[PDB]
Each structure stands twice: as structure tokens, then as C-alpha cells.
């Protein structure tokens with residue numbers, strides 16, 4: 227249980243729920259076929275926000291994950307339970323109006339992922355033990371304009387069968403300036419990109435112990 231509840235841009239936190247569509251509750255989505263897998267949703271309640279955050283293409287933004295909306299610390303238990311091992315992932319989607327677009331449907335492309343490294347340490351553990359900071363590079367080569375940023379953590383501790391995997395995601399509202407437009411990504415849909423049979427979704431992480439992990443979704447877009 228965790229919530230991406232604020233974004234840091236050019237080293238400044240943009241505010242709780244400011245430009246990030248936050249749910250009231252910190253529980254996961256489990257149904258990968260639900261429209262809620264795009265930017266969270268039912269049976270949670272997601273707030274709207276009128277703020278659209280300007281970012282420079284080619285810089286990093288940092289998603290800040292916290293246990294609850296009202297959490298004030300940054301220790302491990304203030305981010306997410308240590309049982310919740312899995313990847314961190316981030317996607318962008320070009321939209322005409324980031325304050326109103328729903329996120330559901332086609333247009334997503336993956337820009338960041340951190341699965342399990344050669345030492346057996348998961349992406350979520352780096353966020354839990356790194357003060358909740360999930361750093362994401364906005365590619366320099368995309369078209370300028372309005373985008374949704376979908377940041378995600380997947381917890382796989384209870385994922386031996388499907389349903390089981392726990393998807394935690396929120397969408398931030400961006401205005402990307404300075405992109406060169408040199409490269410057009412191939413895109414996927416949410417729902418659609420993840421399936422309940424994917425090897426990174428239906429997985430027993432302890433028994434037998436996994437040595438490699440395949441992050442779900444498409445390959446990372448690079449310039």
C-alpha cells in the first residue's frame with residue numbers, strides 16, 4: 227500500500243496532489259483488464275487537479291511515494307511495506323489536454339523500468355529505502371506538448387496466482403517543453419498491455435527463488 231502523491235521538478239516539490247491525480251486510499255488495483263489500471267480508479271476514488279506541470283525534455287522528474295496521503299516522514303515504513311517486492315515503471319501518453327484526458331486507451335509508451343538486478347534487489351526496494359524517490363528521465367527526443375505521466379510500483383509478494391499481483395499507480399499532468407520531436411514512439415493501451423498470464427505478473431518470487439525477472443509491458447523507449 228502506497229501512493230505517488232507529489233512530483234519533484236527542477237529540485238522543487240510541486241505540492242501534495244498538485245498536478246498528480248491522487249486517490250484517497252492507498253490500496254492496489256488487481257484486475258489488469260479494468261479501466262482503473264491506467265490512472266487508478268474504481269473502487270478507489272481519484273481526485274482531479276487543475277495544475278499542469280511544466281518540465282524540460284531530457285531532465286529527470288522524481289515521483290515521491292508515500293504510504294498514505296497524510297504521511298509526513300520518509301523512512302521505509304512511510305513509503306511502503308518491505309514485503310512489497312517488485313518493479314518500478316513509468317510511462318508517458320501524449321494528450322491534447324492533460325487536466326482533462328482520462329488516460330484510458332492507447333498512446334502509452336514506457337520510459338523507465340527497474341526490475342530485479344543481478345544481486346537480487348528489486349526496484350521497489352530502492353524506492354522504499356531511498357526516501358520514496360522514483361527518478362524518471364523525460365526523453366529529449368519526443369514532441370513537445372501535454373502528456374500524462376503514469377508512475378507505477380507492482381508488488382509481487384502475493385502474485386503466485388492471478389489475481390495476486392498488486393498494481394499501484396498514479397498519473398501526473400505535464401507540459402513538456404523543449405522536445406525535439408525527432409522520434410515517434412510505438413504505443414500500447416491501458417488496459418491491454420498487461421495480461422494475467424504474463425511472466426512478470428503471475429510469478430512465485432520465493433519458491434523457487436527467481437534469478438531473473440521480466441518486467442511486463444513494452445520495451446523502454448530510448449532516443
Ligand SMILES: *[C@@H]1O[C@H](CO)[C@@H](O[C@@H]2O[C@H](CO)[C@@H](O)[C@H](O)[C@H]2NC(C)=O)[C@H](O)[C@H]1NC(C)=O
Pocket residue numbers: 286337338361362363
Ligand atoms: C534519471 O532517471 C533515469 C531513469 O529514467 C536514471 O537512470 C538510471 O540510473 C541508475 C543509477 O542510479 C542506473 O543503474 C540505471 O541504469 C539508469 N537507467 C537508465 C535507463 O539509464 C538516472 O539515474 C536519473 N538521473 C538523475 C540525475 O537522477
Ligand SMILES: [Cu+2]
Pocket residue numbers: 227228307310392
Ligand atoms: Cu500493500
